[model samples]
Target: SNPEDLAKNFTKDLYSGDTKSVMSYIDLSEAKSDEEKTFVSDKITQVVAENAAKAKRMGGVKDIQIEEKTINKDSAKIRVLVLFNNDNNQSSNVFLAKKDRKWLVLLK
Candidate 1:
C-alpha cells in the first residue's frame, strides 16, 4: 500500500481502541541512544493514552480520510481526518518512514 493509504489505515486502527494494533504500526527504533529511546517511549505512551481516551469519548472511529501527503524520498508527512460515531471528528498528523521496504509510522 502507498503512504497515503497506509496512513489512513494507521489512524483508523489507532482510534479504534486497538492499542496493540496501533503500536504495531509504529516504529521508534530510529532512536539509538538510551535516552532518546526512553524519550520516544514516553511520547508513545502519552500519545496512546490520549488517543484511547478520545476513542472512548467518541465510541470508536467511523472513517478515516487522508487529507494531505508530503513525501521526501523515503519519508512521508500526512494529515488525516478521523470520524467517530458520535458525530464528532478529529484530525491527526503522522510521519512515516520506509524501513526495509515497509512503511512504519514514526514517532520522533
Candidate 2:
C-alpha cells in the first residue's frame, strides 16, 4: 500500500503544480547526508516548485504516469512519465530511488 500511495501522492502534486504536496512525499530524515537533506529540503524542492510554476507558463502538463519498482524493503525505484507541452514537449520517464527512506529523483 505504501508503494501505491507513494506513486499516487507523488504524481498528484507533480501534475497539479502543488509543490507543497510534492514535499509531503519526501522523507527528510533519510537524506543522503546533511548536505543532501539541505538540498532536498531547500534547493531541490524549490527548483521543483519553480518547474511546476513554469510548466503553466508553457501550457501545463497534460498528464503524468508513474511506474514503481520495489528494490527491497526500505528502497524502491519509481519511473515518472511526465507529459509536457514545452520546448521538449515529450513524455520523459524520470527514475527515482528511495534510499534510507528518502526519495530522490535521479539527475542522471
Candidate 3:
C-alpha cells in the first residue's frame, strides 16, 4: 500500500484496540543487530499496549485523519490526527520505510 494508506490503516487498527494487528504493519529492518531489533520491537509492543489502554479509557476511538505526508525515495513521514470521544484530537507523526517493494511502518 502507499505510505498514506499504510499509515491510515495502522492508526485505524490502533484505535480499534488491536495491538497485534497494529504491530503487524511495523518494520524493524533499520535495526543493525538482533538485540537492537528485539529492543525496538519490544518497546513498540509496550507502547502499543499503553496506547491501547489509553484509547480504551477514552471509550474507544472514533476516527483517524491523515493531515499530511512526505514521501522520499526510501522513507516517508505522515502526520495523523486522531479523534475520540469528548472532542479530543490527538496528533502524531508516523514514519515508514520501503522494503522489498512494500511500505512498512518503522519503529526506529
Candidate 4:
C-alpha cells in the first residue's frame, strides 16, 4: 500500500472517534511482551481518544496535506500538515514499514 495514502488515512482516522479504526493502522510488534503490548495498546487508545476530543474542541479537521514523502526499500516516512476548521494546524512525521506487503504505522 502507498505510505502517503496510509499516512493521510491514519491522520484522518485519528479524528474518527473510533479507536479501533486507528489501531488497525498501527503495528505493535515492537512491544514484545504481553505487559509491554498491553501498555502500548492503552497508550494508543488514549491518544486516539484525546486527538478526537481535541479535534472537536478545535472545530474539527479541514484538510490533511502531505508535505513530504520518502520511500526507502522497506520503510517510509511522511510529513503531514493537518489544518483544522478553526484554522489551527499541526504537522507531524509519520513512519511506516511494510508487513506482508501492507503498510502500517510505525512508532517513533
What are the TM-scores, per candidate, against the unseen true structure?
0.75, 0.56, 0.83, 0.94
TM-score winner: 4
- Summarize candidate 1's per-residue lDDT along 22-93 as a digit string, tens digits: 777878687889898677667666777788898888887778887877987689999889988898877868
Cα-based lDDT for every prediction: 0.79, 0.60, 0.82, 0.90
Q: After superposition, how far is residue 51 of candidate 3 from its true place, in Å?
A: 0.7
The sequence of per-residue lDDT tens digits that candidate 3 reaches over residues 1-108 is 788888889888766656678768987666889998788767767777788888888877788889988998779999999888767889999999887898898874
Query: Could you tell which candidate, 1 or 3, scores higher by lDDT?
Result: 3
Backbone clashes for every candidate come to 0, 0, 0, 0
Candidate 2: residue 57 Cα off by (Å): 2.5
**Candidates by TM-score, descending order:** 4, 3, 1, 2
lDDT of 2 by residue, 13-73 (tens): 7656566776666556557698876777676567677777878887887666665454556
Q: Top model by lDDT, which number?
A: 4
Ranking by lDDT: 4, 3, 1, 2
Candidate 2 Cα lDDT to native = 0.60
Clashing pairs in 2: none
Candidate 4 runs further than 4 Å off: none
